[PDB]
Amino acid sequence: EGQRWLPLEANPEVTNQFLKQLGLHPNWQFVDVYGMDPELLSMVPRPVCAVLLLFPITEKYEVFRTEEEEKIKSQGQDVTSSVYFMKQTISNACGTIGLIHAIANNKDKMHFESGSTLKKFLEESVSMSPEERARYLENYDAIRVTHETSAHEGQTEAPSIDEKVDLHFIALVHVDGHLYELDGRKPFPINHGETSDETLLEDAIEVCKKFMERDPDELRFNAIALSAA
Amino acid sequence: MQIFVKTLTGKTITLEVEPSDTIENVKAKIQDKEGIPPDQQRLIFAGKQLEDGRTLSDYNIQKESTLHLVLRLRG
Numbered sequence: 483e484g485q486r487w488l489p490l491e492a493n494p495e496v497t498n499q500f501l502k503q504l505g506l507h508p509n510w511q512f513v514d515v516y517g518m519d520p521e522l523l524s525m526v527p528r529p530v531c532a533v534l535l536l537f538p539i540t541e542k543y544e545v546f547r548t549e550e551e552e553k554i555k556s557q558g559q560d561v562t563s564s565v566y567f568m569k570q571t572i573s574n575a576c577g578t579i580g581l582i583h584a585i586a587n588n589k590d591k592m593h594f595e596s597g598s599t600l601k602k603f604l605e606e607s608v609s610m611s612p613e614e615r616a617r618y619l620e621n622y623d624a625i626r627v628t629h630e631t632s633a634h635e636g637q638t639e640a641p642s643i644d645e646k647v648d649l650h651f652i653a654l655v656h657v658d659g660h661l662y663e664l665d666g667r668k669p670f671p672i673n674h675g676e677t678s679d680e681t682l683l684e685d686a687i688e689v690c691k692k693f694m695e696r697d698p699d700e701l702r703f704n705a706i707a708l709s710a711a
Numbered sequence: 712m713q714i715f716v717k718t719l720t721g722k723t724i725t726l727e728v729e730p731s732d733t734i735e736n737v738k739a740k741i742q743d744k745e746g747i748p749p750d751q752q753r754l755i756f757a758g759k760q761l762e763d764g765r766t767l768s769d770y771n772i773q774k775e776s777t778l779h780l781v782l783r784l785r786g
């Protein structure tokens with residue numbers, strides 16, 4: 483529908499408030515990830531059911547994304563039917579899409595308020611295709627409004643809606659024994675190998691490391707973990 | 712004295728500071744070295760979030776301590 487939204491801040495306070503407003507109870511809460519070594523990862527509460535990674539969508543990154551897409555289309559990969567994937571068709575909605583991917587793929591572990599708007603979105607879109615889900619989001623006012631409100635929160639001031647954004651959010655989740663990167667800009671989830679309920683954080687961080695070493699001149703990365711509380 | 716600030720990517724930024732320096736001052740020093748605006752910075756010491764108004768001494772941050780820097784970026 484051509485709409486443009488504002489980019490969300492990679493901040494647990496912002497994301498946790500967004501989830502609260504969408505009707506999710508707080509026994510799952512995002513937390514910051516301070517580093518990638520065992521000592522810093524040990525500070526992250528367990529279990530962890532999703533990791534949202536903010537990274538730079540630079541020219542170097544796009545070259546890799548293009549290669550990755552062709553490789554997967556030409557060589558194939560496995561993607562279980564259980565995975566909930568939705569496309570991105572709204573500019574700057576990546577934060578909302580990342581949050582939807584994180585909750586949708588862990589829905590049975592969540593505690594929702596009776597009239598939770600996120601629960602409603604997920605129940606109504608459960609059997610829709612990734613494309614239909616994107617169209618549905620384009621018409622789902624409740625999430626559009628909450629995203630807008632959340633976009634104004636944070637340590638930083640929200641930018642103009644027309645300003646260039648070169649940072650993106652993706653979700654890393656564990657579904658049926660594999661680690662999936664869910665990026666609405668891509669044509670499909672990306673299977674990154676095996677993982678488990680207990681090692682999701684560590685395995686997701688190894689993928690984050692890959693993103694970083696591909697763009698050695700960039701420091702603009704942020705990872706938040708959806709942890710039990 | 713020197714303290715080290717580590718980013719998520721693992722980069723170590725070395726700063727020359729004083730116990731009396733406020734967190735705000737430390738962030739400004741990080742901006743001068745890395746170009747990262749203070750607003751986008753969230754500093755951590757031993758698992759504790761640091762607030763702009765307090766000083767390194769307040770948090771008992773001594774010589775050669777390592778702080779962790781989280782970036783409040785918008786995606």
Ligand SMILES: *NC[C@H](*)CC(=O)OC
Nearest residue numbers: 489574576649650786
């Ligand atoms: N941070 C906004 C979502 C990512 C994006 O802009 O995709 C181009």
Ligand SMILES: [Mg+2]
Nearest residue numbers: 502505506507
């Ligand atoms: Mg609620």
Ligand SMILES: [Mg+2]
Nearest residue numbers: 526527528710
């Ligand atoms: Mg605990």
Ligand SMILES: [Mg+2]
Nearest residue numbers: 588589590591
């Ligand atoms: Mg369920």
